[PDB]
């Protein structure tokens, strides 16, 4: 089966979640093949692994794969940086999305 590159959507923490003294970045990864991806998160330019939880890719109804990655932060962590990024690597190519407070 031919290689298919991932589509990546990154959402910042909601204002509602911040009011609950929590923060989650949500990185949604879809429509890729083969079904192996790696995810790197960065606070500004600094790689971070604390609070990162990533699913094992699973087949979609169209025979391609989907995965998601979450970065759980404190509101103070979130607000302390200029941005955070979710970088998805698939078959040696990378897609990086960045969001800011």
């Amino acid at each position: 089966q031919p290689k298919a590159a991932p589509s990546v959507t990154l959402f910042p923490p909601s204002s509602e979640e911040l009011q609950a003294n929590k923060a989650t970045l949500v990185c949604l990864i879809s429509d890729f093949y083969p079904g192996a991806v790696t995810v790197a998160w960065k606070a500004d330019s600094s790689p971070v692994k604390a609070g990162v939880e990533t699913t094992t890719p699973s087949k979609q109804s169209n025979n391609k794969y989907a995965a998601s990655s979450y970065l759980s932060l404190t509101p103070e962590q979130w607000k302390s940086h200029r941005s955070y990024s979710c970088q998805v690597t698939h078959e040696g190519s990378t897609v990086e999305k960045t969001v800011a407070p």
């Binding site: 959402f11 949604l28 939880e53 979450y70 999305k97």
Partner: protein
């Protein structure tokens, strides 16, 4: 059992096709599986992708459901995700609004 906290993921057109936006709901920290998600009480089915849950270091699960909708609809159409977590007898209907 633990019921989820549900948060709105406000619409964004950065990653979608021209003239569309992606919006969603984050279903955080529940146990055990499963959670079900519908949109607009089951009336909205096109463009919905509910992702498999992640198991976290805490032993709790989280998932997200995202729907891709026409950007022109953002002012005119209400979007509500209907989250059901039967094991904890919790239901949440979260309105997802533009920021």
């Amino acid at each position: 059992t633990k019921g989820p906290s549900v948060f709105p993921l406000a619409p964004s057109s950065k990653s979608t096709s021209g003239g569309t936006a992606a919006l969603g709901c984050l279903v955080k920290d529940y146990f055990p599986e499963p959670v079900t998600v519908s949109w607009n009480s089951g009336a909205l089915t096109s463009g919905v992708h509910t992702f498999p849950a992640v198991l976290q270091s805490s032993g709790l699960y989280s998932l997200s459901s995202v729907v891709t909708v026409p950007s022109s609809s953002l002012g005119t159409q209400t979007y509500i995700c209907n989250v059901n977590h039967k094991p904890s007898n919790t239901k949440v209907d979260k309105k997802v609004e533009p920021k």
